[PDB]
Design a protein around this ligand. Structure first.
Ligand SMILES: *[C@H]1O[C@H](CO[C@@H]2O[C@@H](C)[C@@H](O)[C@@H](O)[C@@H]2O)[C@@H](O[C@@H]2O[C@H](CO)[C@@H](O[C@@H]3O[C@H](CO)[C@@H](O)[C@H](O)[C@@H]3O)[C@H](O)[C@H]2NC(C)=O)[C@H](O)[C@H]1NC(C)=O
Ligand SMILES: *[C@@H]1O[C@H](CO)[C@@H](O[C@@H]2O[C@H](CO)[C@@H](O)[C@H](O)[C@H]2NC(C)=O)[C@H](O)[C@H]1NC(C)=O
Ligand SMILES: [Cl-]
Ligand SMILES: [Cl-]
Ligand SMILES: [Cl-]
Ligand SMILES: [Cl-]
Ligand SMILES: [Cl-]
Ligand code: NA
Ligand code: NA
Lengths: 642, 902, 240
């Protein structure tokens, strides 16, 4: 008995290109399918209509791409939840699934010319308007400027149409203005709930002539370190020359929001050849706090303030280095990249992420699984190690403990972490499972990654599985889908997947197979895997000197700026005095910020696997529906749980 | 000479914090996939490192942020002019021009100059430059202090130039600084008015008169700004809770029967879908389930078609005579189900047509000839009393439900509705049962025909103003109350609604069960409609205008609910009273706050530190400099700084400095002590603390190595390290105890002291032709004849109020006729002036002698200003002398009649 | 004697005006002093002068163009700088949505008080206003702001039973608004089909741009593939 199935993203976006994947199982000849999308529950209007015929030559696999109309006729509010009915009909056989709708229509990014402004001056800004594909788009944007109190002082409704995705604006700061952190907040008109923001400080100031860099010798403070916290002070003119002067350095403890100053830490040191050294003593620190137990300081942070005065007395610069964490270990372990579900009897893959106390990845750090012999694994550049443990077949919950194996460290100093993984629940004790595995090396576009498919199931019903089908989730949508062929008797199969700039910054691969169960009922088995891809710009943009004289320019001199980029690209520029950044380096725009915004919006909520097949689908942001009644549960929330 | 002349030096002046805000495109043809753009840019004047950031947008490639590109702009010799963000007007201040020499093996002998600016008292003037010659060792810097006094507010210019002897090298720096008025900025709230035109205003109009701000302590000649702030205050309406989804689970039923039974089973399923759709409660119920509900409904409909008779009416069995009620009910239900499934237009409209043409009497009444078997299913209609009104009402309602669907097919429909409405209207006042009152009330409300005494009977009939009830089945009362709720909703009487809705929900009735169809259908339709008609927020539509006496056209602001948060501001420089008028529905907030500069006592300056500085002759000239500072806090200050700058040509005693450095509780850098006697004229002394209970004092000798004609006052600044803003600065000078540059002040205006005294002359006497020659000179702006009205005294000036009797020659100032002008003279110039009130005078002078702008504009009696006593007519006629008076007459005549020639 | 009589070097004049009048015979080693003409200054330290040598005159020092201040940028405008020396020019452009007022070209010249200045003074860029958001028959847009500039959008909405025809959004560009939508009452006579049941869009009321599909028992008329539309003027233009 032939079975018809449809797979779509768990969440459907307005004004965004979406794809629906249609599959026929055990079907002969051409199959005609008509797919329509309607509003739920009113069915008042057809949002989209498309048709496609599955041919036996294509290996019975089809897709229909549709964009929900921008119109958003279905009214927003009270916010959530909007739904649509998705219907696919294959040769008079109807399969329908109700899917959740997100009104979000793309991304906005805000760029100001500086990070801080004086009253009376002008804030120049640009609003980059892109879709979920990160491509320039012409839409209507609501823009607000908010005071430190949070009140909107200015409200505009603009269009980026014909602006090549770049909306240049400006705001004049009144001479009499409330100081503080001001916010620029913009949103797509159609998607009022998704607000994108940036901040700028308003303050009376003058630019300093030099910068002060205060850096501890260690990114953290070990609580049992007798030496105390050593801090280096560096002072240099913005034009590169070293500073001679006097520095005042003071320390404090930060616990949450509160800050406790350490008066006795105050020291006055000479800055010679642009350099100075200063120490916070363990005794002073420990005397600063009311609690006699030093261990209570763990989890808290230290901050250092340095004020440097030029010998002329003409210029003074204050600089702070904060969030120096107080630790009992120079390392942290994270299981944020490992699946929380294992399949009994099949190797379980742990994706250990080892970091420094500042959040940065840790390189060449040995890591092992506790309760198990050997299994040492080093860390990659991204601070990622891969571990594998063989599991006994049984529904018993899995408790894994990972510890660092750093040679120069005491056992009390090593980092440790424990996670629990639940058994994948098969249908009717079928004891059938699919498992996906990947090499986990640092991944870049232009390279191909092998994806390994391994199945464990009763050998009597084994012969039935001719293929697997895989779906590639990326930036909230389906990017690719396909099939991987397996002959009977073949436990392991390998799919080579070419990786492109479309895979940036990460993707999930969801594979499944279906068969006729021992119950006589239909049976679907699935697994999902998550893989990181190295961040970079899609395409390239580089700025350097065109003169190439290698000699330093003088004031008022003309020079040649060389820009290299993709053809036809619109390039916007700004030149900023470094002193501004000496005063404020918050809210600068970078590519990594963009990729972060993208990763936060992701539909998929887990690293992989699930409680059941439906769990696997939903977790990676998919809806599966079949004629036999096997479907994922309805998704309650737009936000990822946690 | 061997040095570049000042004029030849073009100062650096372009110091923007940001620039190159440019949009470019990679139009250039690309090798591979990359296109290279070469841009020619002119660098700014700043000496620093620029961060150049680029962001690209591509339709194929997307958005890309490039890595920041740095450009360092550097110079072997330069001036860093360190200016504060702002300076107070008429307050002496010290600034630093720091000179940098970054040559490794070459010292630089340099002449540095502060340019003269009429807006600043400084050393430099128009007649004389302020130049110094200094020497800078290699890999070193030198601080050159300038003491100035800002004379006018706004952006003012400071320029410092420097050139190198024996080297074709120079640099200049031209910067602006904000000069602000004295006193402290204050915000004074003139008024706070709640805007509620319906609640606070007659005839929907609210008027508020806002008074002018009382600026009693406001500094003279200071701009004030009045800010008018409008905001809308959003008010969200509270709606009653919707019935939970789980509680309609039992309402989903599979229809079976029997023309009547099928409808009994069809009723709950249809109304449940209706309520869930309306309240969007399909999520908790289960989305997948909705499909299901539908085909039950479909089933029912299909099945019901079996009991449709050739007349298009309905009955339990095909053999049975058709029921008016059951037919009208099939209409009601099908009409409500027309959204959910495809209903045949012919069936519904056929039933309607049958009801009208077959069952409606000439008076509008509908009649039942074949009552249904299941009396239960007709709920409140079961009562024998007032059957005509109740059944006519019911059928009419069914008709209203079908009007939009059947208006074209059925011609008799508008007339029927009207006819029924007439019968309801005619006999409504005689009703004695709450049920009939409620249902007929709803029917009449649908036609907008429920008004006046009828409306009052309807409302009055409600017990406790929450329900419509009668003795008997509770279900009948639920049904009736649902009808009345629908009526109130139709009437939009939202004030009467909330207790009624609360009561229905309080009953906790969820339909289903024997004899429940009417109560179910009606309660759920009524609640669904409540949800539909419910407002989430109160209406905010405001039109607010403010009328300003300064502006002819009023400013109009419309405040709506979406933009309610948005702050609207209007600003007026004039402190004038105005009126604000608000119209429309909603709530608003008006706030009027005036920002002004207020004269402050005690003085702002030195609030954290007391600082006394003294310079005294010491027992080759040497003096003793004493510095006494006291912190004004509750406890001793932490580590602090004394920034000391020497008088011109003075250096600290080296031995004194060393002994001070070895002294405990203070520190002087090895850098300072190592430095030679010259050319460093700045010294920083770091204090480990500053006492708060007594003056901390120190003293050292200073040696005059260089002699100059003009000596710039030295300065001492004290501040704690953590707060540079909270400082105190004192000046010191031998000739002047205060250290203050000589200046004169009148009211809020100050000018640099100059030798411009009126010249007294003459014993020998003067000719008419000299007057004619001098007055006709181009430099002379005005020539007047006037009388001294009043002589007044100022701190630095003598004032003479002159009523201009005749304008012999008129200047830029227009005195017209008989107006008054104030002529002033410095106290040091008293002996030369001889003025008496009530006496006439011929005066004339230069435009350069003007001071300030009207009002209180002054004429300065300087050296070039002519003042001559004019004898009275009686006196003029006598001897001693007739000559002077005749000469004044001729002077006058010649001047007005012929004037001056080109 | 041997030298000659020299004509003024370019950009220079004689220090002594009397020199040419003097007509003195010049010996070897004799010097003549020059001054730089207005708008120029000496290239090197010391005087600018020529010395008579046996083989003609020889020039020591030179005069080169004086330099103007570095130009300030203009708000909402771009600056094209040809140079900053004497007689150089800067041409001013204005960003889109802005127009230029004042002079579009400036030059580095000699000003009174003998100082190099930019003349004329730099122009100012001003926003092109749109203003006057058009009213619509039986509909209100909103707006409440003036003046609107390039890129500004105003969204129209018809209240009550009126149906909005065309785009609800108007864009202000070049001081000119795009075309407003018209909101008119429209009704649609219920679709009738012999032997067709109807598939979807079966709403009680048909106003604007509603849609329907037909399912029918066999032996049904017309062709082909049906579907339907509702169009303004209550007309229905396709394949019943
Ligand atoms: C649906 O998706 C297919 C990709 O393959 C399918 O994807 C699933 C979602 C199911 O539908 C399955 O049936 C199947 O696995 C898209 O096919 C793609 O076609 C494009 C061209 O339109 C191919 O891109 C390139 O085309 C250029 C020429 O223009 C060639 O030079 C390139 O070599 C390359 O062929 C592409 O290879 C192909 N598959 C991929 C990887 O995307 C199909 O476009 C899509 N259907 C619709 C309606 O969008
Ligand atoms: C108007 O001025 C008042 C008084 O100066 C402000 O009140 C202070 O505001 C500052 C920040 O500007 C705070 O640091 C103080 O804590 C405030 N003091 C008090 C007692 O409120 C007030 O903020 C100003 N008005 C506005 C609109 O900000
Ligand atoms: Cl296949
Ligand atoms: Cl440039
Ligand atoms: Cl009919
Ligand atoms: Cl010259
Ligand atoms: Cl200029
Ligand atoms: Na990534
Ligand atoms: Na400077």
């Amino acid at each position: 008995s032939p079975m018809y199935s449809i797979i779509t993203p768990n969440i459907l976006r307005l004004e965004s290109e979406e794809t629906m994947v249609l599959e026929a199982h055990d079907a002969q000849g051409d199959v005609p399918v008509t797919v329509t999308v309607h509003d739920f529950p009113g069915k008042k209007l057809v949002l989209s209509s498309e048709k496609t015929v599955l041919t036996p030559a294509t290996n019975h696999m089809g897709n229909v791409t549709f964009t929900i109309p921008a119109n958003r006729e279905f009214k927003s509010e009270k916010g959530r939840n909007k739904f649509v009915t998705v219907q696919a009909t294959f040769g008079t056989q109807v399969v329908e699934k109700v899917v959740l709708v997100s009104l979000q229509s793309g991304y906005l990014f805000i760029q100001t010319d500086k990070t801080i402004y004086t009253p009376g001056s002008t804030v120049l800004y640009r609003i980059f308007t892109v879709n979920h594909k990160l491509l320039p788009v012409g839409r209507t944007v609501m823009v607000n400027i908010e005071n430190p109190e949070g009140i909107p002082v200015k409200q505009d409704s603009l269009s980026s149409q014909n602006q090549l995705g770049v909306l240049p604006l400006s705001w004049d700061i009144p001479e009499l203005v409330n100081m503080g952190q001001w916010k620029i907040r913009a949103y797509y008109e159609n998607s009022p709930q998704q607000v994108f923001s940036t901040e700028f400080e308003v303050k009376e100031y003058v630019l300093p002539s030099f910068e002060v860099i205060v850096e501890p010798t260690e990114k953290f403070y070990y609580i049992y370190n007798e030496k105390g916290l050593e801090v280096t002070i560096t002072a240099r003119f913005l034009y590169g020359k070293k500073v001679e002067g006097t520095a005042f350095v003071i320390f404090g403890i930060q616990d949450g929001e509160q800050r406790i100053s350490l008066p006795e830490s105050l020291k006055r040191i000479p800055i010679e050849d642009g350099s100075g050294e200063v120490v916070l003593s363990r005794k002073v620190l420990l005397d600063g706090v009311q609690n006699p137990r030093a261990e209570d300081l763990v989890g808290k942070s230290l901050y250092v303030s340095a004020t440097v005065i030029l010998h002329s007395g003409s210029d003074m610069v204050q600089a702070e280095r904060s969030g120096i964490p107080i630790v009992t270990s120079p390392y942290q372990i994270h299981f944020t990249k490992t699946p929380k579900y294992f399949k009994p009897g099949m190797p379980f893959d742990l994706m250990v992420f080892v970091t420094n106390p500042d959040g940065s990845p840790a390189y060449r750090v040995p890591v092992a699984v506790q309760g198990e012999d050997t299994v040492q694994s080093l860390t990659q550049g991204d601070g990622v190690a891969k571990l594998s443990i063989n599991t006994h077949p049984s529904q018993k919950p899995l408790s894994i403990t990972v510890r660092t194996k750093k040679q120069e460290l005491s056992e009390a100093e090593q980092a440790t972490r424990t996670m629990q993984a639940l058994p994948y629940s098969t249908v009717g004790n079928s004891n059938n499972y699919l498992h996906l595995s990947v090499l986990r090396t640092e991944l870049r576009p232009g390279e191909t990654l092998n994806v390994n498919f391994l199945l464990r199931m009763d050998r009597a019903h084994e012969a039935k599985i001719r293929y697997y089908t895989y779906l590639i989730m990326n930036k909230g949508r389906l990017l690719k889908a396909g099939r991987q062929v397996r002959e009977p008797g073949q436990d392991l199969v390998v799919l080579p997947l070419s990786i492109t700039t479309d895979f940036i910054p990460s993707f999930r691969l969801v594979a499944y197979y279906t068969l006729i169960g021992a119950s006589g009922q239909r049976e679907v088995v699935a697994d999902s895997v998550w893989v990181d891809v190295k961040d970079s710009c899609v395409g390239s943009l580089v700025v350097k000197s065109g003169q190439s004289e290698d000699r330093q320019p003088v004031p008022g001199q003309q020079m040649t700026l060389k820009i290299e980029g993709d053809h036809g690209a619109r390039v916007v520029l700004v030149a900023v005095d470094k002193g501004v950044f000496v005063l404020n380096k918050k809210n600068k725009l970078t590519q990594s910020k963009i990729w972060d915004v993208v990763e936060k919006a992701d539909i998929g909520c887990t690293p992989g696997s699930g409680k059941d097949y439906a769990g696997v689908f939903s977790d990676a942001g998919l809806t599966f529906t079949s004629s036999s009644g096997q479907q994922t549960a309805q998704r309650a929330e737009l936000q990822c749980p946690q | 000479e061997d040095i570049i002349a000042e004029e030849n030096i073009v100062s650096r002046s372009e110091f923007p914090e940001s620039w190159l805000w440019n949009v470019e495109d990679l139009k250039e043809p690309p090798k591979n996939g990359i296109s290279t753009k070469l841009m020619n840019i002119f660098l700014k004047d700043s000496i620093t490192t620029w961060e150049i950031l680029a962001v690209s947008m591509s339709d194929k490639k997307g958005i890309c942020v490039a890595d920041p590109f740095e450009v360092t702009v550097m110079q072997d010799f330069f001036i860093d002019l360190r200016l504060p963000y702002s300076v107070v007007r008429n307050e002496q201040v010290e600034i630093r021009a720091v000179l940098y020499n970054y040559r490794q093996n070459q010292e630089l002998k340099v002449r540095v100059e502060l340019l003269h600016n009429p807006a600043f008292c400084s050393l430099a003037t128009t007649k004389r430059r302020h130049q110094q010659t200094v020497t800078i060792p290699p890999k070193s810097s030198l601080s050159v202090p300038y003491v100035i006094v800002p004379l006018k507010t706004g952006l003012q210019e400071v320029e410092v130039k420097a050139a190198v002897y024996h080297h074709f090298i120079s640099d200049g720096v031209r910067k602006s600084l904000k000069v602000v008025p004295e006193g402290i900025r204050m915000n004074k709230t003139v008024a706070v008015r709640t805007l509620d035109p319906e609640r606070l205003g007659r005839e929907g109009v609210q008027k508020e008169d806002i008074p002018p701000a009382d600026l009693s302590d406001q500094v003279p000649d200071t701009e004030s700004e009045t800010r008018i702030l409008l905001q809308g205050t959003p008010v969200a309406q509270m709606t009653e809770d919707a019935v939970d989804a789980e509680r309609l689970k039992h309402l989903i039923v599979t229809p079976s029967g029997c023309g009547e039974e099928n409808m009994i089973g069809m009723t709950p399923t249809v109304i449940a879908v209706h309520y869930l759709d309306e309240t969007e409660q399909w999520e908790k119920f289960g989305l997948e389930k909705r499909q299901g509900a539908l085909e039950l409904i479909k089933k029912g409909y299909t099945q019901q078609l079996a009991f449709r008779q050739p007349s298009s009416a309905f009955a339990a069995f095909v053999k049975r005579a058709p029921s008016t009620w059951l037919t009208a009910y099939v209409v009601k239900v099908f009409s409500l189900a027309v959204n959910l499934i495809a209903i045949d237009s012919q069936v519904l409209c056929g039933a309607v047509k049958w009801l009208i043409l077959e069952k409606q009497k000439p008076d509008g009444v509908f009649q039942e000839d074949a009552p249904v078997i299941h009396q239960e299913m007709i709920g409140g209609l079961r009562n024998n009393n007032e059957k005509d009104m109740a059944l006519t009402a019911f059928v009419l309602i069914s008709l209203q439900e079908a009007k939009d669907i059947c208006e074209e097919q059925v011609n008799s429909l508008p007339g029927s509705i009207t006819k029924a409405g007439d019968f309801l209207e005619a006999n409504y006042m005689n009703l004695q049962r709450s049920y009939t009152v409620a249902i007929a009330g709803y029917a009449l409300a649908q036609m907008g025909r429920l008004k006046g005494p009828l409306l009052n009977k309807f409302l009055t009939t409600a017990k406790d103003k929450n329900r419509w009830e009668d003795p008997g089945k509770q279900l009948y009362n639920v049904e009736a109350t649902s009808y009345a709720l629908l009526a109130l909703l139709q009437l939009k009487d939202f004030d009467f609604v909330p207790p009624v809705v609360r009561w229905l929900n309080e009953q906790r009735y969820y339909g289903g069960g024997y004899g429940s169809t009417q109560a179910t259908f009606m309660v759920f339709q009524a609640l669904a409609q409540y949800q539909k008609d419910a407002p989430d927020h109160q209406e905010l539509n405001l039109d607010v205008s403010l009328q300003l006496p300064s502006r002819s056209s009023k400013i109009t602001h419309r405040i709506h609910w979406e933009s309610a948060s948005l702050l609207r501001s209007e600003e007026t420089k004039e402190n004038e009273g105005f009126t604000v008028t608000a119209e429309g529905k909603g709530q608003g907030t008006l706030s009027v706050v005036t920002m002004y500069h207020a004269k402050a006592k005690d003085q702002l300056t030195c609030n954290k530190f007391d600082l006394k500085v003294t310079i005294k002759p010491a027992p080759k000239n040497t003096m003793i400099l004493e510095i006494c500072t006291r912190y004004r806090g509750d406890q001793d200050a932490t580590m602090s700084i004394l920034d000391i700058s020497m008088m011109t040509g003075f250096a600290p005693d080296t031995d004194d400095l060393k002994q001070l450095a070895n002294g405990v509780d203070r520190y002087i850098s090895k850098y300072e002590l190592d430095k030679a006697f010259s050319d460093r004229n700045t010294l920083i002394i770091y204090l480990d603390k500053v006492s708060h209970s007594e003056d901390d004092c120190l003293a050292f000798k200073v040696h005059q190595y260089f002699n100059v004609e003009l000596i710039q006052p030295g300065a001492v600044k004290v501040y704690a390290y953590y707060n540079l803003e909270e400082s105190c600065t004192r000046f010191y000078h031998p000739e002047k105890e205060d250290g203050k540059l000589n200046k004169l002040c009148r009211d809020e205006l100050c000018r640099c002291a100059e030798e411009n005294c009126f010249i007294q002359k003459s014993d020998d006497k003067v000719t008419l032709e000299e007057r004619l020659d001098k007055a006709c000179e181009p430099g002379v702006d005005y020539v007047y004849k006037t009388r001294l009205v009043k002589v007044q005294l100022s701190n630095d000036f003598d004032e003479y109020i002159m009523a201009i009797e005749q304008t012999i020659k008129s200047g830029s100032d227009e005195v017209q006729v008989g107006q008054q002008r104030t002529f002033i003279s410095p106290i040091k110039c008293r002996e030369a002036l001889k003025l008496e009130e009530k006496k006439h005078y011929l005066m004339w002078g230069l435009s350069s002698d003007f001071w300030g702008e009207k009002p209180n504009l002054s004429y300065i009696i300087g050296k070039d200003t002519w003042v001559e006593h004019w004898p009275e007519e009686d006196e003029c006629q006598d001897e001693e002398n007739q000559k002077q008076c005749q000469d004044l007459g001729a002077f006058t005549e010649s001047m007005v009649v012929f004037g001056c020639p080109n | 004697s041997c030298c000659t009589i020299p004509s003024r070097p370019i950009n220079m004049k004689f220090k002594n005006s009397v020199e040419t009048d003097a007509n003195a015979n010049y010996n070897i080693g004799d010097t003549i002093e020059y001054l730089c003409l207005p708008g120029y200054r000496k290239q090197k330290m010391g005087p600018i002068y020529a010395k008579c040598t046996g083989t003609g005159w020889t020039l020591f020092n030179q005069c080169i163009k004086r330099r103007c201040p570095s130009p300030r940028d203009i708000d909402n405008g771009h600056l094209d700088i040809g140079g900053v020396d004497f007689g150089s020019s800067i041409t001013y452009s204005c960003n889109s949505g802005y127009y230029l007022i004042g002079e579009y070209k400036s030059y580095c010249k000699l000003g009174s008080t003998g100082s190099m200045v930019w003349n004329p003074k730099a122009p100012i860029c001003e926003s092109v206003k749109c203003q006057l958001p058009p009213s619509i028959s039986n509909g209100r847009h909103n707006g409440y702001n003036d003046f609107y500039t390039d890129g500004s959008v105003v969204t129209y909405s018809c209240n009550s039973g009126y149906s909005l025809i065309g785009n609800s959004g108007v864009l202000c560009s070049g001081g000119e608004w795009s075309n407003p939508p018209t909101c008119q009452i429209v009704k649609c006579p219920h679709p009738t089909i012999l032997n067709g049941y109807l598939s979807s869009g079966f709403k009680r009321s048909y106003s604007y741009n509603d849609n329907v599909d037909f399912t029918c028992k066999y032996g049904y008329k017309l062709s082909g593939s049906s579907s339907s539309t509702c169009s303004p003027g209550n007309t229905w233009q396709p394949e019943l």
